[PDB]
Structure formats: structure tokens, C-alpha cells
């Protein structure tokens with residue numbers, strides 16, 4: 832069922848926003864501030880930005896047909912982070928930690 836799928840998707844995102852994962856999930860909470868220092872080239876490299884607050888709104892506006900569509904946006908958020916940042920950056924390690932949480936939950940549904 833697509834409706835049951837989307838309720839599980841809202842549940843997965845709720846855990847990603849939870850205090851349990853807050854120490855490594857916080858840079859993905861809100862859109863990347865492109866006006867901040869060191870982020871002047873962010874829009875040149877990242878054509879499709881995504882964050883957890885935009886995903887939360889997209890679920891609430893019913894912009895996802897199914898779990899795969901929600902999954903594609905979550906992975907876009909992680910891929911943007913791996914594409915923009917150097918492999919040794921602190922935020923890359925945090926993206927991997929949060930992706931481990933998402934992937935385990937997304938697979939077991």
C-alpha cells in the first residue's frame with residue numbers, strides 16, 4: 832500500500848529529527864545557507880539542494896507518490912553532501928552516520 836508506505840516514510844524522518852541522532856543529523860535539518868562563509872560555490876556545484884525540513888514539507892504537501900520518491904529525496908540530500916564536501920570533511924562523516932539510520936529503516940519496511 833502507498834498510503835502505509837508514506838506513513839512509514841514520515842516515521843523514518845521523525846527518527847532522523849529525534850534527539851537520539853541530533854549530534855550528527857543537525858547539519859541536514861534546514862536548507863544549506865548559501866550566503867554563509869565558504870558556501871559561495873555551493874549553488875555552482877549543487878543544482879538540486881535538499882534537506883530534512885524540505886522533505887518534511889514535501890510529505891505534508893503530498894509531493895511524493897510513494898516510498899521510492901521520498902527515498903530519492905533523502906538520498907539526494909546525502910549525495911549533495913558527498914559531492915560538495917571533501918571526503919575528509921566532518922559533515923561527510925555525519926552524513927554517513929545519518930544515512931546508516933535511514934538505510935536500515937528504509938530497507939526494513
Ligand SMILES: Cn1cc(-c2ccccc2Oc2ccccc2)c2cc[nH]c2c1=O
Nearest residue numbers: 858859863864911912913915916921922925
Ligand atoms: C549538508 N551540509 C551542511 C553544512 C552545514 C550547515 C550548517 C551548519 C553546519 C554545517 O556543516 C558543518 C560544519 C562544521 C561542523 C559540522 C557540520 C555544510 C557546511 C559545508 N558543507 C555542508 C553540507 O554539505
